[PDB]
Structure formats: C-alpha cells, structure tokens
Amino acid sequence: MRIYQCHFCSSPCYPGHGIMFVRNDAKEFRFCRSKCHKAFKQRRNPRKLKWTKAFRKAAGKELAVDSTLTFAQRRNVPVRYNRELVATTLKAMARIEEIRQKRERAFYKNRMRGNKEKDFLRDKKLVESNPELLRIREVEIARKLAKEQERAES
C-alpha cells in the first residue's frame, strides 16, 4: 500500500482514488482526479496552469530547494528489520515535518514584506485627492454627534 503523487497536479493519491494511464513504454501516469486527468487528455501545460505545485515552484511562490526536502527518496536497496531503527524513523518524521513547516512560513513572511507600505501609500494618495468628499464626512460625523446627544439628553 502506497501513497502516490498526481502526475499533472502533484496532489496525493490514496488507494481507490483516481485513474491510471499506461503508455506504450510502460510509463504509468496516475491522476489525482478527473480534472487533472482531463487536462492531461486535452494536452494543457501543467507549468502554465496556476493551481499546480509545478507552477508554484517554477514561479517562486513556494520554497523549492531545502535540506528538509532531501529526505524522502525511493529506497531501492532495503535494510533487514530493526525495531529501534523503525522507532527512530517514526520520531524523525515528525521532527522533520515541524522544521519544514517553520521554514515554509518563513518563506511566505519574507515574500509578503511590502504590503503595509504599499497600502499606506495608496491610502494617503486617495486621502490627498478629493477634499470635498471629506467635508461630507465632516458634516456627517457632526450630525451623528448632536442628534444622538440630544436623543441621549431625553
């Protein structure tokens, strides 16, 4: 029993989910879902479709190369059996996932660094234009004060 990766769309494939196409070279393409599979059949580009991990890595929205990503390989030469080694692997998996999520959040917080300065600049330009729309606001606030206070006077 194995979890596979979607060929077109890079999502996990669990047992009983999706479809597989066997090409004439014994190359097997497993598909996440009918959306990823039909995009394959219509021959669309996965590096061009924006909702895929291939696009996100190639465009630099996600971190692509890291020491935490050098751990899951296809292991073709097996080791015998060792209860202690299995327990160490099961601990190291959780530690590795924790480190990887921390580094991914750090990558996002670095690439989203200018979204306070840009917002202040557009807000100050909008406020610096249209002065007489700010006098309607000044009249509206003073009308909200006096009408409520004489209603609170009652």
């Binding site: 990766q5 979607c6 060929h7 077109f8 769309c9 890079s10 996990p12 090409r23 070279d25 190359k27 393409f29 039909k38 059949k41 219509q42 021959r43 580009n45 996965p46 590096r47 895929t52 991990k53 291939a54 996100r56 890595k57 190369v65 990503l69 050098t70 899951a72 390989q73 296809r74």
Partner: protein, 143 residues
C-alpha cells in the same frame, strides 16, 4: 465533456507526446532513422515527408514545405524548448526524489540541451536545402 473535445481527444485518436518527441530530437542517429523511413501502405506519403516536431506525415513534399512555413509548426517548436516535464518534476514538486530531479536538470542543461539544439539546427538547414526546387505534382512510383 461536451462534443468537441470528445471528438478530438478520444483514446483511439491520441497523438504522440512531447517528451517522446524530445527524445526523438536528441540523438542524431534517431533523426536519421526518422528521416529515412521505409515504404508503408498506411501512411499518407507512403511513409515519406514526415515532420519530427509535429509528428505527422504529409501527402506531398510541397505540403511539408507549406506546413514548415505555417504557424502551427511554430507553436509546436516553441513548445519543444526546455525541460520536458516528466514524472520527476511532479515528484520533486511534491518534495520527493528531489536530488534525482536536480541531477536531471543540470544534466539536461549541461549535455542533452545543446545536442538537441545542434541536431535541430542541422535538421532545419537540411530540410531547407532539400525542399527548395520541388515540383508540386508527385511521382507515384515508390521504387
């Protein structure tokens, strides 16, 4: 789907794949094997006048000449440019077999890339030399 994509992309109407055509365009011996085809009764130009990028057979040689001038061929040539998107790209995008994919990428930018480009250059000048003073009618004689 509806009707159009069902009519075109049906499994018994499937066309060849980009990474297979990329491995065809590498290895100059494979280019000579694809240019010097035998006679075949079920191919349009008796197995001759074959475009390697757009993996289709032409009727005449003047048909191949106008196809090479056209705009569908330029779309396929622009598609067959960089790293050809195998399953290794999907695996490494998921975070798996990443060192193997990195070896593959540096290998294709070191060795197989300029070889493919030099074969494609030689093939373009050879086809432009051959398809120059060709008549429009064809001798049906298959020798």
């Amino acid at each position: 789907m509806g009707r159009y994509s069902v009519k075109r992309y049906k499994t018994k109407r499937r066309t060849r794949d980009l990474d297979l055509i990329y491995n065809d365009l590498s290895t100059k011996e494979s280019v000579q094997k694809l240019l010097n085809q035998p006679l075949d009764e079920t191919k349009p130009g008796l197995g001759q006048h074959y475009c390697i990028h757009c993996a289709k057979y032409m009727e005449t040689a003047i048909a191949l000449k106008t196809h090479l001038k056209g705009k569908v061929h330029k779309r396929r040539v622009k598609e067959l440019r960089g790293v050809p998107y195998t399953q290794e790209v999907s695996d490494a995008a998921a975070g798996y077999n990443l060192n193997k994919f990195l070896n593959r990428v540096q290998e294709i930018t070191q060795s197989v890339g300029p070889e493919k480009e030099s074969n494609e250059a030689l093939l373009k000048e050879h086809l432009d030399s051959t398809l120059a003073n060709v008549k429009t009618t064809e001798p049906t004689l298959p020798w």
